RNA sequence: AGGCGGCCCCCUGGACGAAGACUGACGCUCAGGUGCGAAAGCGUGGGGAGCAAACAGGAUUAGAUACCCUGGUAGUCCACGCCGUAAACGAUGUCGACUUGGAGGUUGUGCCCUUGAGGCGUGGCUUCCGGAGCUAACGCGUUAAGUCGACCGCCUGGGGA
């Protein structure tokens, strides 16, 4: 109903996936978009243009709030963070703080034991 | 030396992002780095560093 | 390989003075027989003489004018999987990728003489209004859209 | 020293040169002895400047 | 030996050295004897987040009893008990002694004409090259597979066991 112009973005980028979430302040979402719904699926859910078609349709979907003024909470090894970041810059909004937040093992519950890569 | 817990020495030890930098970039003896480590480890359990910069 | 051409040099048309003349009937002849490819231009321009805007010196031009792409799709292998790629169209195929959709179109038809059946095609090459005739373009209309991996 | 930036950041800077993988920790691990037996041709310390 | 890590406290086993002290061969090994699981399993009783044999659902495919993927029991965890299981494989039974160098780290113990941001003796641990000699060969290489005494087990084709 009101603009805010402030809030905080929450962007999961992995080499098989992409997810743009926008919330206030307290963290509820004002928007979401995921690439699987922009129509891109396996390992190129992960590309530069596949990450631009939800981060805009995410910007597009906070745009009854007016926001200007922006702080990133990133997950994920995937290098689409940059681009992601610029093409949701694209919709005039100013990013003053980026923080990597990545579930990269801490963890809780078992620890796995195959190998990867 | 002199009371471990001083985090102004702990945080020339750790990255940007707070990891434990390696032997090699300090020149440090194993012996040491060891023991520097548990003193890192420990500040956690002392509230003087989170244990990952994420949290 | 890669010590090979490029590009060999043909000698232009000698009453047009263009290259693009010589060109055409190299690739409109069949059998090598040039002579009755040099019955075939200039008579199918006929009906273009006077409905050519740029004049009848460009006639021919303006249906290659109307096509002048930068890449194609293409479809490539990488591994066990096989994937579409841009590539570059390049100056000397800039001007001539028309100039082959055009032949082909007449060589496919079968109605008159071929100074007709070429004059069928050249009639709408810059007007472009006929049913399902663009999609001779979505080989380049999908290489300004790739978007690949990077 | 690699990304010390803290806040506002743009592109990639992930892809650096020395420590982490050759220069002078991890991967070349099957050459073993090479860490320590060549001293002077691969090992400036030695004491008196940064240890 | 298997192994054992996370933070704090109390209790607590074993190792190692120098100048002296004490018994005065009191020692070494050892058939039987008495002791000790990484795991999986079973047994008495709990417990179920994570993961998952089995089984189901869907795919891929000739089929797919596998991988992928939505679920899921037993088991994993615990108070514990039984077993003695294995690549228990770093393939070196236990004790004693002689010998050739180096690069490196740690821990005792004793020294230094310490202009060192340290150095050097001498014990214990100890990584990796390397000389003699042994082995068919890899290599072992002073922490020996060299050399040589003490004690207790094991070996003498494979299929079948």
Redesign the interface.
């Known amino acids: 109903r009101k603009q805010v112009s402030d809030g905080v973005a929450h962007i999961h980028a992995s080499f098989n996936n992409t997810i743009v979430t926008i919330t206030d302040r307290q963290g509820n979402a004002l928007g979401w978009a995921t690439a699987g719904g922009s129509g891109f699926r396996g390992s190129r859910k992960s590309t530069p243009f596949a990450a631009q078609v939800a981060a805009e349709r995410c910007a597009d979907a906070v745009k009854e709030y007016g926001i200007k003024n922006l702080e990133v909470m990133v997950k994920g090894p995937g290098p689409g963070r940059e681009s992601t970041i610029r093409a949701l810059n694209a919709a005039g909004f100013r990013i003053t703080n980026i923080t990597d937040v990545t579930p990269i093992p801490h963890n809780g519950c078992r620890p796995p034991k195959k190998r990867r890569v | 030396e002199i009371d471990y817990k001083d985090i102004a020495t702990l945080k020339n030890y750790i990255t940007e992002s707070g990891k434990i930098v390696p032997s090699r970039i300090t020149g440090t003896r194993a012996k040491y780095q060891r023991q520097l480590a548990r003193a890192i480890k420990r500040a956690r359990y002392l509230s003087l560093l989170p244990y990952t910069d994420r949290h | 390989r890669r010590r090979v051409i490029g590009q060999r040099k043909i000698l232009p048309d000698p009453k047009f003075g263009s290259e693009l003349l010589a060109k055409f009937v190299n690739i409109l002849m069949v059998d090598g027989k040039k002579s009755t490819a040099e019955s075939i231009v200039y008579s199918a321009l006929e009906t273009l003489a006077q409905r050519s805007g740029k004049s009848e010196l460009e006639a021919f031009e303006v249906a290659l004018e109307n096509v002048r792409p930068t890449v194609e799709v293409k479809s490539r292998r990488v591994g066990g999987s096989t994937y579409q790629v841009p590539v570059e169209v390049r100056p000397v195929r800039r001007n001539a990728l028309a100039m082959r959709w055009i032949v082909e179109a007449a060589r496919k038809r079968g109605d008159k003489s071929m100074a007709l059946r070429l004059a069928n095609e050249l009639s709408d090459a810059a007007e472009n209004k006929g049913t399902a005739v663009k999609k001779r373009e979505d080989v380049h209309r999908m290489a300004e859209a790739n978007?690949?991996?990077? | 020293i690699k990304v010390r930036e803290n806040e506002p950041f743009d592109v990639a800077l992930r892809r650096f040169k020395r420590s982490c993988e050759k220069a002078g920790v991890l991967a070349e691990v099957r050459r073993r002895e090479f860490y320590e037996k060549p001293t002077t041709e691969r090992k400036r310390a030695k004491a008196s400047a940064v240890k």
């Not at chain 3, 978007?147 to 990077?150: D, G, I, L, V, Y």
């Open positions: 978007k690949a991996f990077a």
